Amino acid sequence: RGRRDDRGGRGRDGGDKSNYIERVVSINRVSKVVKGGRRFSFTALVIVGDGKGMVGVGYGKAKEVPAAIAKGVEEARKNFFRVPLIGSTITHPVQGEAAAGVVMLRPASPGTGVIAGGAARAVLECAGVHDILAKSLGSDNAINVVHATVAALKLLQRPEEVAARRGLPIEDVAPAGMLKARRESEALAAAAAREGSA
Amino acid sequence: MPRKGPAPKRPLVNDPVYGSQLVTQLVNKVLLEGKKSLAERIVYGALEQAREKTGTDPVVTLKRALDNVKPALEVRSRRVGGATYQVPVEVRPDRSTTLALRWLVNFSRQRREKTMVERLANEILDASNGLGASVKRREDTHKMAEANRAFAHYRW
């Protein structure tokens, strides 16, 4: 990924809507032996997302690096994924496993900061979280820890969803501090939203 | 043209003077290269010398010598497992005529007459009686075939 700063007198750079947040996690040239030598190709693990908390995971195969990055962008574009939150935190401590990828995603009080390793830091920095506390146990990789983090975010659910599963009136599903954090986060959603209307 | 099957062969015209497939084929096997006309002068002159020493039709003498050198079995060199096996095989008609004419010409060419005409005349005559070295090569080829009859079973 070099020589991107450019000014063209051509038709268009085609800049348009959906200015999302896009992170390229790792690139390892992938070789293939054929008759008389090696054929080098490229893999780019592409994270895309918006600051609401919708995450994509794309996996680009091409024999050029920006081609593989662009194919990962289109593949994560094809496949988004909804993550439920509280304010800008996570709901409750989970462990995700993608066959060797263990990631523990635990919430924290706000202000602490996204503390995670670089793959999980990528998937969570694209997402709508600002203050959680994760760790990547096992598998020491990028692909399995990204995919394990997304499986960990599939083990998430709303407080309300849990209440619904059990047919119980909330209050009765959460404890009270987390309901107060719901009041804080929806209150600042009201303040920034009504400042957004004017 | 092997490994694709049998290949089509050229049809061979007969002799102008004598009128036989076998005379012309003897000419084309007399042909030390270049001079087919001189091969015709050798074959024709040798068969009129056979006409002198027989007083008969020369092509009958030629086909009787050709019959008396013509083999029925040929030995091969097929090798099953670390030993070379002389394998005897039935000889086709064209293969037998080829061995008859080719042995006739070559062992006429070894014989010690002055020209080639007297060599080929004396070899067609001695092969007609049965006294040439070429008939001894027929008997040595059937000696190798009958001596090696057992290996012939492979059906090969």
Binding site: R3, R10, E64 | -
Partner: protein, 210 residues
């Protein structure tokens, strides 16, 4: 390695015309010598200018030198000042008198020689070579009418020690078909690390037009 014959020399009987055109008995070696020194004389300033084709028609010892380029305005500066200087030096170097016709191609990007010009002149200018090319297979595409393109770059690419050849394309470029109308142009970039020889094949169409 790739033992590929120059396709403008592989279809020079069939589709592509000769560049130089006359008849000569016992004057031929002299006409060759003048043709060579003319093309050396038109190498430098016109390779600054954007030269693509140098045709020399030759009538009864006058001469007619015709050039196909991509900017009438650098070849013809002030009228007669930039034209009649190289024209007059062609009149003095040759022992003859020169009728220099200068004409524009309605595009570059679909002259293979001019695509090789712009690519190699970018590649001497420290740009990214895959953005070098893949910028050229870009444009040089589209434009009118062009049914394939094929760009190869060997040499010290990016200043590296290994001489890596690259191979980008789009569409149909059949070389073995003789009704191809393929334009071919190889021009060689001059970096400080060395020379990056750029080959460009451009397949315009199926059309014989016989």
């Amino acid at each position: 390695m790739g033992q590929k014959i120059n396709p403008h020399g592989f279809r020079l009987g069939i589709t592509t015309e000769w560049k130089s055109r006359w008849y000569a008995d016992k004057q031929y070696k002299d006409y060759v010598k003048e043709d060579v020194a003319i093309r050396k004389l038109l190498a430098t300033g016109l390779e600054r200018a954007g030269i693509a084709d140098v045709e020399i028609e030759r009538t009864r010892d006058r001469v007619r030198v015709d050039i196909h380029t991509a900017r009438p305005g650098i070849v013809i500066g002030r009228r007669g000042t930039e034209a009649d200087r190289i024209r007059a030096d062609l009149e003095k170097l040759t022992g003859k008198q020169v009728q220099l016709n200068i004409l524009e191609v309605k595009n570059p990007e679909s002259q293979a020689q001019l695509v090789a010009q712009g690519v190699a002149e970018q590649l001497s200018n420290r740009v990214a070579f895959r953005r070098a090319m893949r910028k050229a297979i870009q444009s040089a595409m589209r434009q009118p009418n062009v049914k394939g393109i094929r760009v190869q770059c060997s040499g010290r690419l990016g200043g590296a020690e290994m001489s890596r050849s690259e191979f980008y394309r789009e569409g149909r470029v059949p070389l073995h078909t003789l009704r191809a109308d393929i334009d071919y142009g190889l021009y060689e970039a001059k970096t400080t690390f060395g020379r990056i020889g750029v080959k460009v094949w451009i397949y315009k169409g199926d059309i014989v037009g016989g």
